[PDB]
């Protein structure tokens, strides 16, 4: 994955996060559990809806096919009919399935990124106050109960 | 205390392809092909096809004795139509430049038909003896009920002048014919006249047919042929028929509603009592799919057709198991 | 003490597309797709167009007698044409192959008139009646000039035998006609003979037409019928004429100076006296943007053509407000 | 945007800075400004071109219409004549604007990446000399005046 | 002590291209177009073409005496024409459809010659003088071998009527040909009879053919012309042969076995005594390629033509010093 | 290069590691050299030769000229099917030529990307037991014979 991220440094997904494509799991005194990050949801959802609807749009504009007969002695100019509206189906085939091929390898970069820039902006935040592990997660050097873990949460954290 | 940046997984099994790699499963996907339709032919916008069953185009417009259910048809959405359908030309021949008629077919949804020339009103020759056992009916010789098989009156056949000016406003379709019979007798038999020809004129037509006395193939137990011919009478203008003998007349003509937007598809599907915004000569299809693979051939509010067995795409990210 | 890093910003209001996100304003742009012309025909490189007026190419080709503007007419880049102009064949009929025919002239860029069969040159045929008032010039009935309408003399008309060599190392255009009586009657009063035909053959022309005394509508006032035909006669090729009457003469014909490179557009517009490098038929382009949506027939140096309404790259950033 | 930096963990774009496209803000005892870094600037300037002038170039082979006529009764191949260029047109729009649509994409990122890459090349020589305050800043520890800072902008920072 | 994250150089001299960096020089590239060929005409795994050599497919057809190297030639794989070939219509004329049937023969492999109208057989009709010197074999007068220009017997010729029922279970290619002397003598002198006719008919044939007299340029010292006419018999069907003059009687005709893919190539070379599973009118593609610009016009197992130069992949990474 | 290693923050390729395409260089008191590292280099090669096989298939459907011939008077078909066959073979060549173009875009940074997935792998495990030289290597404090790099390489490093 380009961005390192998703099936990377974090080796899998969230079974338990229902509620979002990216957020945290944190795990302290008081118990734990998962909350989504609305806003990168938010964005993620936006590029990826409007992605699809720019997809469905510029592939409209596509070659219709017209019937049109021809009789015994017409051979070559039925044929060149035939080589022509076959040569616009491939066109048109061609290009929507590389399209998908392509634009289906920038969704999941995509996705990757989101999470990469979400890890970025917890970890600076996180300056010194807690062990980076490597994989995903951050242990702190302090006690950090549900006000506090909400803190990081919020983008707020920042004992200013 | 720790705190963990993650992502959404899920049962999903749905997978989607890329350039590096394929069968990717994700939490989500999208798949924008269409690939299933239902088998039947419908009416489009509550509009029926006219569906010629074992009727060709020819056996429609010549009315094919044998075409009886379309002697004056309701407007269409669509014409279908069968690769090989019995009922063409009953009496051996040619359609002359019949594909260029069937593209303006192609053009029309409507044909209101009305007498050009009664088969009463003409004096000097005989045309209720213009029937062959080729053409059946009912069990009796017949021909094409919207042109006359004029024959020669007590052994003389006069020049033939006749004229029609066209005072609907609609373009009038025009159809005509004429008789190569097989041998120098039967011409005499027929007509009287050896050596004959029919001309034709508008403000645009200048045609002089002339027939083709020629010894070839029993087909449908028939040796001779007709040929037919058509026009588009302009409306306010008049045609100008003239001939000594072999002359297949107009009876009736077609009305042009030109209503525009339709199609001659190749099925040899029944109609099947149903609703559609969009048919294919396969059966119809039903989705908001911005693709299918059913059929390049299709009329009305229509995915765009491709040749993939497959397109879906990703919204969600990597499940990870 | 701080060092920040960053980038950019400025007032550009300028938004481009994406696949993503649409209308994302960026700090710099290129539009690239041209969306002006200047509305007129102009000279291509300083060479003008012939702007055929009221005259249809036909009408031009067999001068017309409205069309005198286009007698002799100098090389031309473009040729312009109307949708419908009113100065075609003046006496009613047709051109034949006239598509294919103008199909040259998209690869012609100069004629140079020379007379092969001069009009005094006929010693048994009158050549100066053969005049209808459907071809008027100054009020006077006329005929187009390029031909020659040939009628019977003190009551006879002989058979013809004209032959013409290409003495020049060009093709020649060469345009003859036959005439279409209504009647067996203006037959005999033109030409006597009621049996007529023109024959014409060079290496590979071997033609024998033959009159249709059929009877047809007025086309202006005219019940009779022209039907122009043409040949491309090699140098050193000779072509060969001969008739008992019908025939148009040939009494001129053109050079063709194949300059290469030629459309015939359609456009309502007259003369705008610009000059310019790339025209199209609502107006002249001058960019050098990679593309425009104006029109996509064009001659000369142009952008693609796209239908696009707006094509505009990032160069710049993302700018921020 | 992929890489994070551009309306991402730097909020925003820098009207002051009117020198280039990417570089530095310095603020100290002896006052503050912008300053334009010239080499990703120049790389920058460099791949937008070639780019404009590869779009420019692989779409002019494109298809020209061409005037055909045809009489009363050709109007099947004149049909045919027409689906064929509105055809070749609607594949050449399509091809046109979504190679614009893809590659404005893939510029916009470009100078994400950019401003990250040039980022990263400070975050590394300011090592352990600075706070990473998380927003395109970083605040030293050590007073850090215009011969200090210039040190930073010519990459020739480092204790040796 | 150190560890250090780092990449793969080498000496790899390949160069790639990106959209925004041309020329970048990479440690591992694929290049994917082919560039060769072997610069022959070669069998199409293992199955000799047909090259015509001098031979035109028409020359070749109705056996132009200069073309007896082709007189019963085996299942090729494709056919090989000039541009111009000097063997053609040894008696100046044309080919009725001629591009039309050169079209049949791109999807036929193999045709087998058989005889459906003797030589000796015209009883009334003199078979044997119907030689020109134009038509040359060996210096002596000869003719299409594969049709009988038949000529009167005593001074009369009695109306033809010949009939040829095909009871193979293959498609019958007939060839015949009408001719036309150039005055009225020449008819008379070959034919006895002013006015003539060959009127043709099958199952779908509807011929009536009638000479052609008019006077034109020399072409192989012949005034005349032969108008070549063809048809394809089905199984079981009949053509109808009835002619009093200007006839050129089938004598052979070909036996289709279509066993399909081919086509006519032009090309200017000789055969090359090689074999390939791709061949280009340039030379033959031995490669695994997905691509090749050689020439877009090939048969076989081939890679995709296009237009470029030059299309590398970089497999490997940015090559630095 | 967008992922700000290859040509980056690593001048160079090494001449010297012959064995993959990402790999290690360690330098100790035991001697020095280099070590590809497997699992990257796989990764790349199954990722780009599926590029390539799909690269050919896709391009596969494309279109077949054939040959046509017409008499004096069809000039206008004849024409029609020359800018058929040409206009065809355009689309094909530009379809080809840009897909070539962009996925070789496509294929550096992904070498890219795996290098910076590659230091970034490093540097999360060699925690802040190491400087980060600022330059793809990173200097330990604590002495690292034979036994500890393979600790790095191997992915199990970290004191437990
Ligand atoms: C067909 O009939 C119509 C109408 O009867 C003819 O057109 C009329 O002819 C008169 C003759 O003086 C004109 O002045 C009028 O313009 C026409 N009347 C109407 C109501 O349109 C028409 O000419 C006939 N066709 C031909 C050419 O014979
Ligand atoms: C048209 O005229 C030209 C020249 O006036 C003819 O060509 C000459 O004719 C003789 C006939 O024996 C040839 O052998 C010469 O080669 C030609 N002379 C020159 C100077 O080229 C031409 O043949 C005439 N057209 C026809 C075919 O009748
Ligand atoms: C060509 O000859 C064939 C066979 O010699 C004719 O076909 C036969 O015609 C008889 C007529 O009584 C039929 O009953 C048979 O079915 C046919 N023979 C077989 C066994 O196929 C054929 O009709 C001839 N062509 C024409 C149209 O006259
Ligand atoms: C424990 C604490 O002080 N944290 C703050 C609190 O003051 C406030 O109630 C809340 C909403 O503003 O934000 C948090
Ligand atoms: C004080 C210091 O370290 N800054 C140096 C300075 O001495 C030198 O004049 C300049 C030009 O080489 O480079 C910088
Ligand atoms: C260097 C070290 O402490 N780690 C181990 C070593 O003890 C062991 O012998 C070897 C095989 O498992 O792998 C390594
Ligand atoms: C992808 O998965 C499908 C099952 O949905 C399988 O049939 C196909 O062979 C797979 N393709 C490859 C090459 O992995
Ligand atoms: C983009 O901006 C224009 C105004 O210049 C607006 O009309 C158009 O709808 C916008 N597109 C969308 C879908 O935001
Ligand atoms: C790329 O390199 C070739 C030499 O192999 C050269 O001819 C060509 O001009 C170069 N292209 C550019 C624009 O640098």
């Known amino acids: ?160 | 205390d720790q705190i963990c940046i993650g992502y959404h997984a899920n049962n999903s099994t749905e997978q989607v392809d890329t350039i590096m790699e394929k069968n990717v499963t994700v939490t989500h996907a999208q798949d924008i092909l269409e690939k299933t339709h239902n088998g039947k032919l419908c009416d489009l916008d509550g509009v029926k096809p006219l569906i010629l069953r074992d009727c060709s185009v020819a056996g429609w417009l010549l009315g094919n004795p044998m075409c009886d259910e379309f002697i004056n048809v309701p407007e269409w959405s669509y014409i279908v139509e069968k690769a090989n359908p019995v009922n063409d030309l009953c009496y051996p021949g040619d359609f002359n430049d019949y594909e260029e008629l069937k593209h303006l077919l192609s053009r029309i949804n409507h044909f209101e038909k009305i007498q050009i020339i009664p088969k009463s009103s003409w004096s000097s020759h005989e045309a209720s003896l213009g029937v062959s056992s080729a053409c059946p009916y009912q069990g009796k010789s017949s021909f094409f009920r919207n042109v006359v098989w004029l024959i020669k009156k007590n052994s003389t056949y006069p020049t033939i002048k006749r004229s029609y000016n066209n005072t609907n406003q609609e373009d009038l379709l025009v159809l005509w014919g004429i008789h190569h019979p097989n041998d120098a007798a039967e011409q005499t038999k027929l007509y009287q006249n050896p050596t004959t020809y029919i001309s034709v004129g508008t403000s645009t037509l200048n045609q002089r047919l002339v027939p083709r006395i020629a010894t070839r193939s029993k087909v449908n137990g028939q040796s001779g042929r007709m040929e037919f011919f058509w026009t588009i009478l302009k409306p306010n203008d008049a045609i100008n028929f003239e001939s000594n003998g072999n002359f297949i007349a107009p009876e009736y003509a077609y009305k042009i509603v030109k209503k525009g937007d339709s199609t001659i598809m190749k099925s040899e599907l029944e109609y099947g009592n149903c609703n559609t915004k969009c048919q294919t000569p396969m059966g119809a299809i039903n989705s908001s799919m911005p693709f299918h693979n059913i059929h390049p051939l299709t009329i009305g509010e229509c995915p765009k057709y491709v040749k993939s067995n497959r397109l879906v795409l990703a919204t969600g990210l990597r499940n990870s198991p």
């Open chain 1, 1 to 160: 994955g380009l961005f390192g991220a998703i099936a990377g440094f974090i080796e899998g997904g969230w079974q338990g996060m229902v509620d979002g494509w990216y957020g945290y799991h944190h795990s302290n005194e008081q118990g734990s559990g998962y909350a989504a990050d609305k806003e990168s949801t938010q964005k993620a959802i936006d590029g990826v809806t409007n992605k699809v609807n720019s997809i469905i749009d510029k592939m409209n504009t596509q070659f219709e096919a017209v019937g049109r007969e021809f009789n015994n002695l017409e051979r070559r100019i039925e044929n060149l009919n035939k080589k022509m509206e076959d040569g616009f189906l491939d066109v048109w085939t061609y290009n929507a399935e590389l399209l998908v091929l392509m634009e289906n390898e920038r969704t999941l970069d995509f996705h990757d990124s989101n999470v990469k820039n979400l890890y970025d902006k917890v970890r600076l935040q996180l300056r010194d106050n807690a062990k980076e592990l490597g994989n995903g997660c951050f242990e702190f050097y302090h006690k950090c109960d549900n006000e506090c873990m909400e803190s990081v949460r919020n983008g707020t954290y920042d004992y200013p």
